[PDB]
Structure formats: C-alpha cells, structure tokens
Write a protein that binds this ligand. Structure first.
Ligand SMILES: [Cl-]
Ligand SMILES: [Cl-]
Lengths: 7, 147, 147, 7
C-alpha cells in the first residue's frame, strides 16, 4: 500500500 | 496427502464452524465463511480487488502479526498455503499475490491481523447472494476433495 | 521466551551459516545474509523499495509457495514473524508490508519463493558496503538479544 | 503488483 499489489 | 496432513494439523473436519466470526469491530456472516480451523478462518472479500480475492484471519482478535502466538502463526500460514492450492484449482491459476498489511502505515483498515490471497492472471462491491455463492463453491470443493 | 522458542524451532544458533546461498539463478553474498535457519535464510535487498526492505527465502530452490513442504512453510513463516519483531526494534516501527509475489503474474522476477518484509512509516540501488553494514546491524542485534 | 505495496 499504496503503489502495487499488495504493498 | 500433503494437504490432508495440513488439514489434520489445522484440526479441520467437514462442517467445522464457529458460533461467531469477529473481524475487528465487524462481524462476518457465516454464509461468507468457507473454512474454520483451530485458530483461524477464511472468508470471501466484500470488496475484492480481483476475482477470487479471499481473506484469512485469526478467530481471536489480535491487531498486529507479532501479537500472534506460535500455534496461531503456524495455523494461519498452513491455511494460507492450503487455500492457495484450493484457489489455484478453482480459479485455474498457479499465481497469487499473498499479503499482510501489518499496521496502519501498511494500509490496514481493520485492526485485526489478516492475510490477503489474490489469484493472478495475465493483464488482470458484492452482495450477500454473490458472496454466499462464492463461499459455497469453495466450501463444496474442499469437502469433495478432503472429506 | 516467544522469540527464543521460535529460534529453537528454526534450529538457529549464533553464527549458523550455509556453504552457499542460492536465490533463483543468482547467488547471494554471505556478507548480505543476516540469518540462516534449518530451511530458510534472510538477506538484505539490493534494490529496497524503502529502508529496511529485507527478503526471506528457502535454502532449497522452489518456484511456487505450493512447492514448499509443511516443515518449510512453518520455518519460513516463523522466521518472518521473528524478523518483523527484530526489524520493528531496529527501524523503530510497529508497521510492515509483508508479501509473497507467488508467480510471474503476481510480479515475481526471481523463480524462487521469497517473502518481502518492508518496514512502514507515515508518508513513506545498494553497494556491497551498505548491504554488509545493514546485514551486520541485523545480525549483531539478533546475537545480542538471543545469544 | 503493480498498483500498491505489495500487490
Ligand atoms: Cl476494526
Ligand atoms: Cl531466477
């Protein structure tokens, strides 16, 4: 979170 | 035998359930739950990022991953591996995004440890009806293959 | 005692090492490794997304999470929980992004199961020197607190 | 991957 799946 | 052995470690049996399913301050409808283990449960996501997006959480409300006891860490992680196998067979994929948003600054919105399992494919809100249907498909498959 | 108990389960001891560290087709320099267990190892990331970004992988090359044996699943996951505790103490945070890119369509670039642990804070390429320094800080802390 | 950390 919040730039890719799942960060 | 690998997955049957995991289910034995998770103390699973067909129709195993909990009287209530707490997720943070929220309560999960029993119709949305596809598996219950000694320490964890799996339920379909009401706001999936992609199809087959599921959540695994502890039966006991614990905020951070480091609040879990050794037995809970093993339980939730063996369930995760088992569910990637099941979802793999159901959604016809070998690829998954697996993640824990461990804390507010990691994007956690519900104060209760949970693992996201998201099936993945090339270039990839839900009603109780759709959720019950999805949970039923998962539960039915587990029952068919594992007794 | 919780973390000491995990280390006993991981069969860890101060200075435990492996003769070689394989990661997919790549080889990890021993200077970048901060912990070795019965089935896994932890190493500093050469391309961190944020400070303290570390990787955990299996000593045996296995492509998918579902290729792991029960003992390996337990080992790598107990190490993950242990490392969130250590990194939490070192980077002064309680929040982490924990993730497995399980397959090419989940963004996996190295064909070997690995867990990403990324310390997280509000509104958040490396040389062998910086990497050795970071791995040394982690290894030194584990040694100091756990014998 | 590729829209948030770490998906
Ligand atoms: Cl909550
Ligand atoms: Cl590779």
């Amino acid at each position: 979170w919040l730039a890719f799946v799942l960060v | 035998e690998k997955y049957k052995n995991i289910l034995e470690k998770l103390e699973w049996y067909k129709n195993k359930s909990s009287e209530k399913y707490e997720f943070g301050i929220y309560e999960i409808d029993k119709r949305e739950v596809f598996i219950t283990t000694k320490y964890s449960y799996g339920f379909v996501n009401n706001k999936p990022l992609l199809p087959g997006h599921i959540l695994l959480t502890t039966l006991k409300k614990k905020k951070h991953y480091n609040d879990l006891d050794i037995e809970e860490i093993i339980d939730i992680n063996l369930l995760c591996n088992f569910m990637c196998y099941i979802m793999g067979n159901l959604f016809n994929t070998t690829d998954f995004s697996i993640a824990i948003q461990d804390g507010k600054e990691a994007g956690q919105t519900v104060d209760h440890v949970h693992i996201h399992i998201i099936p993945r494919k090339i270039n990839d809100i839900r009603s109780i009806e759709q959720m019950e249907e999805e949970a039923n498909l998962i539960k039915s498959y587990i029952n068919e293959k594992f007794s």
